[PDB]
């Protein structure tokens, strides 16, 4: 996920 890769979201929630 591009968002997670740029430190914008956290895929653990």
């Amino acid at each position, epitope marked *: *996920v591009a968002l*997670e*890769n740029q*430190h914008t*979201i*956290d*895929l*653990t*929630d």
Partner: antibody, heavy 120, light 114 residues
């Protein structure tokens, strides 16, 4: 010990090794886990990461194709499997916990390391 | 992708005096959220690495204030205001600009010049 790793291993060239890293339940569910190795007398080398909650894996280019990370959510344990072992793979393999994405604030919790020796 | 320089390779410092360690990235580490994704780690003899500074200038918990990280973009510096014997080990910088790609510098051995 917050992150428990499996014991030391010796394997023949060409075979495989699987190293485990067990965290607490709550730690496992909120974390990514990096694998960092250190050859004898050498520096640290990042091999990749797994985010167990979403079963997401990223591999360092140097290791793509012969490393696999897996995770068992029921035991809060993630695994590193390194295949087609070479002499150059003799190293200590560290598990390191970190936050995912916007929660990344460094690899703040480290395992003790697992010594893997490749020898005929 | 991104290459990390660390200098010097070894740094002898008289106890009580300051030390300065440099880390260089081939690409800016500054993200769109304003954070520089450069960490510093310390590996003491016989131990696992431990986090010292995260994201450029943030001290990890329990890290004394004589450790400080500075810099942005491509040039970063770890300063120990006053070195003491317990600080001996190898210091590594690390970039995490993309969450999916982490890269260590080559490391700097701190030598206490007793």
């Amino acid at each position: 010990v917050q992150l428990e790793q499996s014991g030391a291993e010796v394997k023949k060239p060409g075979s495989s090794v699987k190293v485990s890293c067990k965290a607490s339940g709550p730690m496992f569910s909120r974390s990514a886990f990096s694998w960092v190795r250190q050859a004898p007398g050498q520096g640290l080398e990042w091999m990749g990461r797994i985010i167990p909650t979403v079963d997401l894996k990223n591999y360092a280019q140097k290791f793509q194709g012969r490393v696999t990370f897996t995770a068992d959510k029921s035991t809060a344990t993630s695994y590193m499997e390194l295949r087609s072992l070479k002499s150059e793979d003799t190293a200590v393999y560290y598990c390191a916990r970190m936050g995912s994405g916007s929660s990344y604030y460094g690899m703040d919790v480290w395992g003790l390391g697992t010594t893997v020796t490749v020898s005929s | 992708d991104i290459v990390m320089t660390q200098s010097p390779l070894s740094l002898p410092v008289i106890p009580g005096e300051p030390a300065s360690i440099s880390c260089r990235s081939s690409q800016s580490l500054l993200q769109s959220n304003g954070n520089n994704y450069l960490d510093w780690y310390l590996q003491k003899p016989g131990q696992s690495p431990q986090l010292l500074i995260y994201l450029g200038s943030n001290r990890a918990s329990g890290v004394p204030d004589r450790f400080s990280g500075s810099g942005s973009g491509t040039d970063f510096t770890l300063t120990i205001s006053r070195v003491e014997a317990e600080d001996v080990g190898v210091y590594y910088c690390l970039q995490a600009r993309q969450s999916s790609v982490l890269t260590f510098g080559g490391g700097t051995k701190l030598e206490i010049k007793r």
